[model samples]
Target: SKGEELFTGVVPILVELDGDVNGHKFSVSGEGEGDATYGKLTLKFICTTGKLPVPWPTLVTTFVQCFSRYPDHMKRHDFFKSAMPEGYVQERTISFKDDGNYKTRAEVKFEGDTLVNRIELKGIDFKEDGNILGHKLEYNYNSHNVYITADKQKNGIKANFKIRHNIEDGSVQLADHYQQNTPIGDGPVLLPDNHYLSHQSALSKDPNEKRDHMVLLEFVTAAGIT
Candidate 1:
């Protein structure tokens, strides 16, 4: 059976970046067929800026490093480490409120549905300093794809982010994001909010399509090295 195709959704591209990891911001567009549950399609999109893309294997190794403490906490102390592998918990908070004492449990399990490994970091909102982020953080991983979410009630901030690294192609995608924060004197900055989008790479090219919050970077799409 054949059905009508309709396109919906569109937005402007925003570029708030510098050279190298500085380029086009991708918006998005979608096509629907017939009615609900009648058709399916997916589009691969990426942002245009970033440091040299991390090789798939390298990223896997990097993620495994975070699990080194083995189902517990010691070496892994921050959530942003997802972006900055060597990143550390922010230093010297104004008060212990931001750095709460907490406990964590980590795990790595091979997907029952797939041969690949799936790693996860859960259990936190508590910090080593006896204060807490107020919300337990959860980070999930599979191959070069990653998703992280965490919120702090005391600090009045929350963040949700997702990214896919196609090392084989040297390309990457900024998938989805939400700041989930309150606006206070330049506060509540979102991840894909024109701020984090422009710091990836300086390579530039005009996108074929543009939808809201859609950024695509084609560096040399990879071949599933995972």
Candidate 2:
């Protein structure tokens, strides 16, 4: 008996999405660095008055749901690495929890439905600060940011973000704007004021990979956590 079989307690929970891009209101979440594996899935598309209501900043990943473990499952290990974006497939996770407090609820999936991605994880007293555009904003604790979209091919998001000025201190809690015409793909892409600050986790950073290949097979690599 291979340890007598019968077991399953996987956990890498992360979910939240309130909806609204053109209507201006946002929240989309995902995280995986623990509980299973795979990295750089810090997906967040937020706007709770911190401002930056979208029309751009799009992220989509389906490399078997970010290197595997979602619906169809794709398993590999060694911290995986990402460089898949040729012929453009799809995939998407993230935000800290560090696994502390210990509260359990089952039912997850954001931006599409199944809200409630909660976990104090010994960190969530919540931090806040003020000011923006003119500068000075800090959300030192419960955080989010991951900008830079488009330009990999066919409507990626536009030019790709290039942050500005001195940063750090909650990384300037949500404050960056501009995106006019933004139709990228058939046309549109010019709205200078800086392109982004955070919110692009369909698995970017593919400057054509170091030795990565197989956008042909469409992202195949993979695992579990509890």
Candidate 3:
């Protein structure tokens, strides 16, 4: 008995990650969505960055404390700790959709093999406020030729999720995420309706070195399409 109930497909977001950084052992299992409009009066938009790993007992105590304070870099730190691996797997995955004309974008980038330097997920967009719908995710991550821990860091993340549904009891409302990053501190956990937008963080920096970081998210909003 009402008008304008238009929504055309695409609205499934499920993401997961199990954690560790600086002490190594990170993870990510993925899915992402929410974008489709047929017009009645509506709108929309979307990681900004995460990657941390330097295990192998923090790369053998940073080359055994810099091989007694830099003894000619001790033969290339024994050829970069026998070319380490068994660590540094800060995985990647990011799926997206947002076609309200804001130039939808989705990405997942990784450059790995050894001395890692760049891991990224740089774009996503959708925006609207009158009816409340927004998805803005951004990311920038950095790692470089090992300089002494902190996992050779550089990070930038911005997740702005403000979604609303329940068009007469359909149930889905994650209302409000103007700019977030503290779901325990590795970012991304926006929960309000379905209840699972999660991230657990420890990211140990030393002092007995115990680490763990986790991430998970789910968002669904869909309707009949034609």
Candidate 4:
């Protein structure tokens, strides 16, 4: 049991960069499972439309390679849909075949124009960890929010991230805006632990469009999503 199995099945979450930020062009594929004996990580985020000659988002765990009872020697490997990035467009394997009951609710689908398709953190908290300003987050297991849907409207693309978890000094603070809601920042930004490290940041409540708009996060764990 490499990493102590029990991940049940389907643990896919693609979109490794292709985020043009807040205007619509963000990307995120989905699939979930990792009860870890009830630590909980329900999962479901199919927020579609990256448009472009479509077709490329339906691995739904690839049926675990013809299901021989799923346990193909562990150490998971799939290479993010064989390296997908250029004009990605995926979202119709029956949208992951929903069985309904999205825990708290959120599953819109009017097709091309109703938006808000899917989302279900399911009150996530699998071994929650957080330590602001020094960088060390585990919140939703590898904390993610690749601009999921920006904000939905009104100058969308918000921000309010903070962290701290040093293996000898860490950093990953962010708070470009959000007054009375608290979260104002100006310092701390160094999260170098090494291993596919790619850090980029930007946010603006429009102080002359400070940096215009950006919200990208990346940190992998749990055996790097097997």
- Over the stretch 1-226, how does candidate 4's per-residue lDDT look in tens digits? 3212223443332222232211224444443332322223333333344331111211111111111121233223211111111111122111111111101122222223111223221211112122222123222212322111222122112222222211223433232211111111222211111111111211112244232222222222222112
RMSD of each: 19.9, 19.7, 24.0, 19.8
RMSD (CA, angstroms), candidate 2: 19.7
State model 1's lDDT. 0.21
Q: Please report the TM-score between candidate 2 and the true structure.
A: 0.20
Q: What is the lDDT of residue 54 in candidate 2?
A: 22
Residue clash pairs of candidate 4: 131-164, 132-163, 133-163, 134-164, 135-163, 135-164, 135-165, 136-164, 136-165
TM-score of candidate 1 to 2 decimals: 0.19
Candidate 3 wrong stretches, greater than 4 Å? 1-8, 11-20, 36-226
Best by lDDT: 2
TM-score ranking, high to low:
2, 4, 1, 3
TM-score of each: 0.19, 0.20, 0.16, 0.20
What lDDT tens digits, residue by residue, belong to model 3 across residues 125-212? 3234211132122111111112221111322223343332222234332322222111112322212111111111111232442332
lDDT tens digits, residues 143-223, model 1?
322222234442222333343423223433222323332222222222211111111111222366342222222111111
Can you give the lDDT of residue 183 in candidate 4?
A: 10
- With candidate 3 superimposed using the best TM-score fit, by how many Å does residue 18's alpha carbon deviate from the native? 8.3
